[PDB]
Amino acid sequence: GEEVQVIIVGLGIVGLAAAIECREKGHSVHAFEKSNILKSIGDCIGLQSNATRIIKRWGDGAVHEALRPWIVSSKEIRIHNSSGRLIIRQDLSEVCEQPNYLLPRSELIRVMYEHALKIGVEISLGVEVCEPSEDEEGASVVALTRDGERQIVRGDFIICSDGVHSKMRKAIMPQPVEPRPSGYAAFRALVDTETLKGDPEASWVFEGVEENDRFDVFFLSGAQIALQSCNKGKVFSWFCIHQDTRNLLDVWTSPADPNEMLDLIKVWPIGQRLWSVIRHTQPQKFINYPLLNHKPLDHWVSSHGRLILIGDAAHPLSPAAGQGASQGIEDANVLATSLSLAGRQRVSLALHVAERIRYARASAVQLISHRVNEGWRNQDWDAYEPNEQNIASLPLETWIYGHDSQAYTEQEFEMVVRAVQEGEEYHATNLPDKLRVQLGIRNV
């Protein structure tokens, strides 16, 4: 008569999604997080329809109602050259037939955090989780507080949602593999809306944004730039993918030099117009984030089946991919659904089933994303004009964004159980079959 006791390590987007999914499906959750996750840091996150389909179920629609102001209203991507001439309008009608969100990461965290608290997730901030262990009966972690005190916490299993720099990862893969730099990085930030509104030279950027979010892309030699708005022009954000061979750390806090962006764009005709908006970025908010290529891990689940890596701890993707957060939300949904179908007496089975459902699909998205990091889509802009050939297509793939991970898990659960228990390979159909072999994905 006792609920499953889930421990969650890390309350980024994925840990919060896992906490909500598990709690809404009738499991007890104690989540731990080392930092004040409500602090304003980073820029905007996109959530595609594969993630919003999951979010819509939470609280009988309550979270979707809270996120309604952030539904993407762009009907097209406007693709421009280095003169700012519009070359192509790329239709988003299919991509946006179901909701997508774009919003500051800090606002998404706030909404999810408040819902988690409302539904009875137990949350402990200021806790660095250390030293996971497990056996056939249970798992435990050490909760280290800032006073140096150590508290043992026991549960049925541990969700390791501790991000790209996961220290839990070594409990599954003890040998760490460094990612390869792509040679590219992304300048990116939110624009200060207040100083933006006060600048007559930037007023053009507000045109139409109350009815359709801005989604402008500009291709210049050495730059892929996007300007976006969300929530009827309350928020503007931008990024610029550019060549960079410096030894940049993949964190969201390091100082970056705005004049590097100005130098890159000012030499092209459209540069001054782009800078009229971009210059309103606050100086300590200018981030230059390296686009690193991480290889799929061999597997995500520990030897006794009571620890699982999800989110960026398992499959980090660069922010240029568009599917990073959404794939992590799929992890949370598949894991919670698998746990609910397996039950408390079959925890290792639940985690291994979730891994077999998720691994190939997540790895395909990860491996494809290495292409946008390496600039495969760029051409010589002295000769070519940009068009749909140059837009990375992960956000446009129906096999990704149209997928219902919960329905797939319910329909396939017993077949995956059979594969796990008979020691056979499970061939998931939640990615195109030609993609496995083409990308070299090896099933777990």
Ligand X SMILES: CC1(C)c2[nH]c3cc(Br)ccc3c2C[C@@]23CN4CCC[C@]4(C[C@@H]12)C(=O)N3
Show which residues are catalytic: 188, 228
- The response to whether 156 counts as a known ligand-binding position is no
Q: Smallest Cα–Cα separation from 287: which of 195, 190, 193? A: 190
- The response to whether 416 counts as a known ligand-binding position is no
CA 406 to chain centre: 18
8 Å CB contact between 428 and 357: yes
Site for ligand FAD in 127-186 (CB under 6 A): 127-129, 161-164, 167
Q: Is 178 exposed, middle or buried (0-12, 13-18, 19+ CB in 10 A)?
A: exposed
Asked whether position 307 contacts ligand FAD by CB under 6 A, the answer is no
8 Å CB contact between 348 and 335: no
Give the residue, chosen from 7, 8, 20, 37, that forms a contact with ligand FAD under the rule CB under 6 A.
37
Residue placing its CB nearer to ligand FAD in the complex, 10 or 271: 10
Coil, helix or strand for 161?
coil
Q: Is 421 exposed, middle or buried (0-12, 13-18, 19+ CB in 10 A)?
A: exposed
What is the gyration radius of the CA atoms in the chain, in angstroms? 22
Residue placing its CB nearer to ligand FAD in the complex, 328 or 375: 328
- The response to whether 105 counts as a known ligand-binding position is yes
Q: CB atoms < 10 A from the CB of 302, how many?
A: 23
- The response to whether 3 counts as a known ligand-binding position is no
β pairing state of 5-9 and 28-33: parallel
**Cα angle: 67, vertex 68, 72; to 5 degrees:** 100
Both tokens of residue 371?
């292409």
Give the residue, chosen from 132, 324, 386, 395, that forms a contact with ligand FAD under the rule CB under 6 A.
324
Binding range to ligand FAD, per CB under 6 A, among 43-51, 272-280, 365-373, 394-402: 43-51
33 binds, among ligand X, ligand FAD, none (CB under 5 to 8 A by kind): ligand FAD
Three-state SS across 230-276?
ECCCCEEEEEEEEECCCCCCCCCCCCCCHHHHHHHHHCCCCHHHHHH
- The response to whether 43 counts as a known ligand-binding position is yes
Residue placing its CB nearer to ligand FAD in the complex, 142 or 415: 142
Both tokens of residue 227?
């300007």
- The response to whether 129 counts as a known ligand-binding position is yes
256 binds, among ligand FAD, ligand X, none (CB under 5 to 8 A by kind): none
Asked whether position 11 contacts ligand FAD by CB under 6 A, the answer is yes
- The response to whether 14 counts as a known ligand-binding position is yes
80 binds, among ligand X, ligand FAD, none (CB under 5 to 8 A by kind): none
92 binds, among ligand X, ligand FAD, none (CB under 5 to 8 A by kind): ligand X
For residues 85 to 124, the per-residue mask of contacts with ligand FAD, x marking binding by CB under 6 A and - elsewhere, is --------------------x-------------------
Tell me the C-alpha distance between 308 and 304, whole Å.
10
| Number of residues binding to ligand FAD, judged by CB under 6 A | 34
Type of residue found at 110: R
Contact residues: ligand X, CB under 6 A: 46, 72, 92, 95-96, 100, 217, 224, 226, 241, 320, 322, 372, 391-392, 395
Tell me the C-alpha distance between 289 and 282, whole Å.
16
Report the residue number whose CB is nearest to ligand FAD. Answer: 12
Q: Is 260 exposed, middle or buried (0-12, 13-18, 19+ CB in 10 A)?
A: middle
Residue placing its CB nearer to ligand X in the complex, 323 or 430: 323
Residue placing its CB nearer to ligand FAD in the complex, 119 or 142: 142
Asked whether position 290 contacts ligand FAD by CB under 6 A, the answer is no
Residue placing its CB nearer to ligand X in the complex, 133 or 393: 393
User: Annotated binding site for FAD, which residues?
Assistant: 14, 33, 43, 46, 105, 129, 312
Q: Can you give the binding site for ligand FAD, defined by CB under 6 A? A: 9-15, 32-35, 37, 41-45, 105, 127-129, 161-164, 167, 252, 311-313, 319, 324-325, 328
